[PDB]
Amino acid sequence: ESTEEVHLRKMASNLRQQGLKCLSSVFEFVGNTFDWSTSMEDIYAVVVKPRISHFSDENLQQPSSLLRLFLYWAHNPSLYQFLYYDEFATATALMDTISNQHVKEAVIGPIIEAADSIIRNPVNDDHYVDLVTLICTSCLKILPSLYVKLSDSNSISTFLNLLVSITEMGFIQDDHVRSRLISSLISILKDTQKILKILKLIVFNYNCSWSDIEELYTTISSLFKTFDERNLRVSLTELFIELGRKVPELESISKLVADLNSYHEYDFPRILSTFKGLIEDGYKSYSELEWLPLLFTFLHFINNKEELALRTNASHAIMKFIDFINEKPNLNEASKSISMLKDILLPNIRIGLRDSLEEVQSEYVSVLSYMVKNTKYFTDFEDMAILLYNGDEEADFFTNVNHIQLHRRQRAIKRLGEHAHQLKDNSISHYLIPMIEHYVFSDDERYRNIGNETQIAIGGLAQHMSWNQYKALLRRYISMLKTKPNQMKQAVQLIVQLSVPLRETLRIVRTLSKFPSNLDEPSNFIKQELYPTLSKILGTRDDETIIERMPIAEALVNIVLGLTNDDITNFLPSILTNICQVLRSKSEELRDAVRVTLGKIS
Amino acid sequence: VQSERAFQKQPHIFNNPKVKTSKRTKRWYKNAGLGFKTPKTAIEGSYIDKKCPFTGLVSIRGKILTGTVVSTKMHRTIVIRRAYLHYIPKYNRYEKRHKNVPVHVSPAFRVQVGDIVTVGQCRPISKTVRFNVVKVS
Amino acid sequence: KKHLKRLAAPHHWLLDKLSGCYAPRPSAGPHKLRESLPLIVFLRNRLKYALNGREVKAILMQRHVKVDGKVRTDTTYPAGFMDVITLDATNENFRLVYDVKGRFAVHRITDEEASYKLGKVKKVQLGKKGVPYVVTHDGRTIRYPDPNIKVNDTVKIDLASGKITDFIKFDAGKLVYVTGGRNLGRIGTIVHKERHDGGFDLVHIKDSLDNTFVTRLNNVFVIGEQGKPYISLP
RNA sequence: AUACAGUGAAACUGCGAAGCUCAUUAAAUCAGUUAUCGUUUAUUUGAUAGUUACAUGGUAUAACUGUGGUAAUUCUAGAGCUAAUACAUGCAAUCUCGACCCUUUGGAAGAGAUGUAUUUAUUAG
RNA sequence: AUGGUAGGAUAGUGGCCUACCAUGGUUUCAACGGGUAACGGAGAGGGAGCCUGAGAAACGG
């Protein structure tokens, strides 16, 4: 019928839609029980055959009744002859849907999980052998694109379920199939155990060149620090043991990494010998690729909180790298190591300095000390070296901040604060404050005197600080005020310590490094973020925390004095009235607390 | 928990036996507000109490009072005592009085005779009970 | 009861106590009885356009009076706060606002001012079929509101279409009209909102003279920003 | 006014029918206030329902006509009519994902989706 | 009689009522009881039951 008969056409479309669903429903419920063999040719010829040509175009969005028919036939071995019909046009129809660029994840998943079923369901006929070959070739070619489109974790998993099915069958024995399969895997990298078992199988059975597995070697090497579970770590080692026999160059590295990681418990004597092996002439020999996995293991040993011996060797192992950087004839060879040092060590050092455990922190403190003492090619720590005064003891302050005695620690933080101006702004924020701030929030009474001296030093450090880091430092501590009730007294006193350097810098300009030239921009930052937040906290009616929140007002006046005079008139009244309202409170002890605070503000 | 003839359960809360995702039975709880921290024994408890301010179908609204517990002998309710100084103008002097208030207490709270309890107004739980213990000290 | 004694009438109409035995009882409508102005008192005892209730009834059957752009023929129709009374035969538009004394004061306005009103958001909730809507102080249900609109905000409503053209959030520094208590009719800027959960919230308001006063939130109506009211004030 | 058409008794529907005399009671009356997330609510106001038909029946009678009983009542039976806002019945659309990227607002293959009220169970919130 | 659990009634909470369970609750800080210039709330011939309505146990039936 032509276009003018709209009503009949719509009803016919409804009949097709309902009946195709009717076919979909009946095959689901009684497909296995009923024998279709008489009707298979009739069903295909009148239903499937007319629509095979446009199937790919129609069903890209979401699964349809007609698509679900071929999915069901794909799962059931008995109904594969539906796929076999007409040179696998039915299977090719499912193929081309995947081939389409506009195909969405909802349609991808069922077809892929259907393709897995055909791969895992051997059938004894010639048509089956051809069918699997066509399905594999299309999928492997196009796998990396599908993974990008996928947005569901389960959809990721089913891809690995198909992918491991390929390895078990043995399409990977073909070199082209192996190359396409590897391309999909790096797309997945660019569930985890299933990935590792897949990598083991592909790389175990067949040989690979260094250029092929080099990028894999780096990322799988970087996965050492990332993994922590024994099953996850052990499975990684057989790969490196495996990558070793693939490329004779890596064989030495994997044997080392295999003996660096020993399992369930680590072999303490043999690993100790390896550390003695590297420290005694082994560390001049190993190359940059050799150094990569060794660090990821060393950074794993230093963070470990149970054993001391592995750590000192690990921290010493990290210092051998710094020696190994010194050994270069020039900067060019060092630069590749320096960039590698910057990419890996420095980020993990900074988090290590923030590590709560003191003794883990002490090692990272020691590693940071050695680099500054030996700065032949790495010049970022020159400023902190100036603080060291050639690494002199009681002047280097790396020991002082972590002697056994507490009084020597306190004397360090004062001298560090005094000489803050000489130091470079980035270093103060990334290393020094992280290493020293935990004293402020330390609960032990032995460190209470240390904490009070710390609050002064960080205030001096905050003066000679870069503008962006000081903002981020200040914002974090306001977040600590709302988030941490226990640390609220420590945060508020510290926020006051941060308020003073901002006030003085704003006084001088009308000091913080890279301070903006225009005073409006810092002023608006105070007006909209520091003022409203601090004022509302001070105005909060919580009688259990009023005394701890009183020094907030001292922070309010400091930031306000930094502002312009019109702002100062706008902002002093609300603060001082709130101080006056707290002054009005009946409690004498509170009233005295207001009186002293008003005195300091005066 | 199941010490009654009927089965005690939180209404409209369903634990699906077939799925069996988690051993712990699904528990519904709410915060009563007013900065009154919901205790963890209520969150991770196993009791069933329709009149509990955190797990029951009761809302705290109205006057919030404080008192001293004087009796804790009956089940899930207590009697507190509130004292004040009433002014008599004819001689211009104050006289002490007291009032005894029955208050519901959830099993999530452990109260003895002598402690200070802050209680909240709610719908009439019983003939004389209209409050619910919401903070113990 | 269906009869109201003139002495027993609440205070705000300014009606003389000795005129008669009974006063008009406001009928059911958008506003509560104790803060409504039935059209009879507005037309007779404030404007004096009518001398007796029968003359008022002739006026209303003439369909000369419109409340919020709609013709009303009930003598005791309860006009209230932020209600626009339009008289086309004489070309007047009036807005009903408390005075400092606390009486309704007859305030002439422009036609553009007449075209809209201000409504305090009393409630915001999802209706049937998942359609959000807002209930204002005059009982107006307005569907598909702007998401940022919340309770205690004030929405500027166009009378002709009854849609939301703009809104004002409830925040410190906003200009406010007091609709209850002793401060009824006073205008001032918000200073601080003191919250008692489970109790009546209290708001501090500072006038242009720097005098400060405290009032319950229920008697608070945001009318604009400090120095920029959205309605003409008396 | 060739259905009737103004007014309009009766009848059927719709709405509303919500001063006196005795006793006596201490914050159980009453007055002020709070809450109803524990609630019903004519009416007023504003919103709100696309899911034989060029119009179904008496499954209907009053008023009305006519025949009678009774000392008799806002006491009565028999027979015969005719209507509804009374009584029962009841009936070829829209919106999405959208290839073709055809034209680049745009059309568009196909795939889909589509009341309310009560009760119960469950899921999200 | 004080409270808990479950049910019945109820526009609805609620010993308002019902089945089991614990002996509780106010009070010398005046519970309970008595007197009073506490005019300083009831019925429609008398008790019982029922009907309508949004609103009554109706000065209606």
From Swiss-Prot, chain A:
Which parts of the chain are HEAT repeats?
137-175, 177-204, 289-327, 340-377, 427-467, 469-505, 528-565, 570-602
Task: Give the subcellular location.
Answer: Cytoplasm; Nucleus, Nucleolus
Residues in a coiled coil are: none
The task this protein performs is described as: Involved in nucleolar processing of pre-18S ribosomal RNA and ribosome assembly.
The record's comment on protein family reads: Belongs to the UTP20 family.
Assembly behavior: Interacts with snoRNA U3. Interacts with MPP10. Component of the ribosomal small subunit (SSU) processome composed of at least 40 protein subunits and snoRNA U3.
Q: What is this protein called?
A: U3 small nucleolar RNA-associated protein 20
Q: Which organism is it from?
A: Saccharomyces cerevisiae (strain ATCC 204508 / S288c)
Give the residues of the full protein shown.
Answer: 1040 to 1662 of 2493
From Swiss-Prot, chain B:
Q: Record the organism.
A: Saccharomyces cerevisiae (strain ATCC 204508 / S288c) (Baker's yeast)
Q: Name one GO cellular component term.
A: 90S preribosome
Q: Which Pfam families match?
A: Ribosomal_S17, Ribosomal_S17_N
Cross-link entry Glycyl lysine isopeptide (Lys-Gly) (interchain with G-Cter in ubiquitin), positions: K9, K40, K50, K51, K73, K90, K99, K127, K135
InterPro entries referenced in this protein's UniProt entry, alphabetically: NA-bd_OB-fold, Ribosomal_uS17, Ribosomal_uS17_arc/euk, Ribosomal_uS17_CS, Ribosomal_uS17_N
Posttranslational modification, per the record?
N-terminally acetylated by acetyltransferase NatA.
Q: Which residues form a coiled coil?
A: none
Q: Where is it chiefly localized?
A: cytoplasm
Indicate the quaternary assembly: Component of the small ribosomal subunit (SSU). Mature yeast ribosomes consist of a small (40S) and a large (60S) subunit. The 40S small subunit contains 1 molecule of ribosomal RNA (18S rRNA) and 33 different proteins (encoded by 57 genes). The large 60S subunit contains 3 rRNA molecules (25S, 5.8S and 5S rRNA) and 46 different proteins (encoded by 81 genes).
**Annotated family:** Belongs to the universal ribosomal protein uS17 family.
Cell compartment(s), UniProt: Cytoplasm
- Reported function: Component of the ribosome, a large ribonucleoprotein complex responsible for the synthesis of proteins in the cell. The small ribosomal subunit (SSU) binds messenger RNAs (mRNAs) and translates the encoded message by selecting cognate aminoacyl-transfer RNA (tRNA) molecules. The large subunit (LSU) contains the ribosomal catalytic site termed the peptidyl transferase center (PTC), which catalyzes the formation of peptide bonds, thereby polymerizing the amino acids delivered by tRNAs into a polypeptide chain.
This protein's superkingdom? Eukaryota
Q: What else is known?
A: There are 2 genes for uS17 in yeast.
Gene name for this UniProt entry? RPS11A
Q: Which PANTHER family match?
A: 40S RIBOSOMAL PROTEIN S11 FAMILY MEMBER, 40S RIBOSOMAL PROTEIN S11-RELATED
Q: List, alphabetically, the NCBIfam families matched.
A: PRK08572.1, uS17_arch
Q: GO molecular function, one example?
A: structural constituent of ribosome
Q: What is this protein called?
A: Small ribosomal subunit protein uS17A
From Swiss-Prot, chain C:
Which InterPro entries did the record assign?
A: KOW, Rib_uL2_dom2, Ribosomal_eS4, Ribosomal_eS4_C, Ribosomal_eS4_central_region, Ribosomal_eS4_central_sf, Ribosomal_eS4_KOW, Ribosomal_eS4_N
Q: Where does the record place the modification Phosphoserine?
A: S27
Q: Which CDD domains match?
A: KOW_RPS4, S4
Q: Biological process (GO) annotations?
A: cytoplasmic translation; translation
- Covalent cross-link Glycyl lysine isopeptide (Lys-Gly) (interchain with G-Cter in ubiquitin), where: K57, K129, K156, K163, K169, K174, K206, K228
* Listed Pfam families: 40S_S4_C, KOW, Ribosomal_S4e, RS4NT, S4
At which residues is Phosphothreonine found? T110
Subunit info?
Answer: Component of the small ribosomal subunit (SSU). Mature yeast ribosomes consist of a small (40S) and a large (60S) subunit. The 40S small subunit contains 1 molecule of ribosomal RNA (18S rRNA) and 33 different proteins (encoded by 57 genes). The large 60S subunit contains 3 rRNA molecules (25S, 5.8S and 5S rRNA) and 46 different proteins (encoded by 81 genes).
Q: What does this protein do?
A: Component of the ribosome, a large ribonucleoprotein complex responsible for the synthesis of proteins in the cell. The small ribosomal subunit (SSU) binds messenger RNAs (mRNAs) and translates the encoded message by selecting cognate aminoacyl-transfer RNA (tRNA) molecules. The large subunit (LSU) contains the ribosomal catalytic site termed the peptidyl transferase center (PTC), which catalyzes the formation of peptide bonds, thereby polymerizing the amino acids delivered by tRNAs into a polypeptide chain.
In the record, the note on similarity to other proteins reads: Belongs to the eukaryotic ribosomal protein eS4 family.
Descriptive protein name: Small ribosomal subunit protein eS4A
Q: Lineage of the native species? A: Eukaryota, Fungi, Dikarya, Ascomycota, Saccharomycotina
Gene coding for it: RPS4A
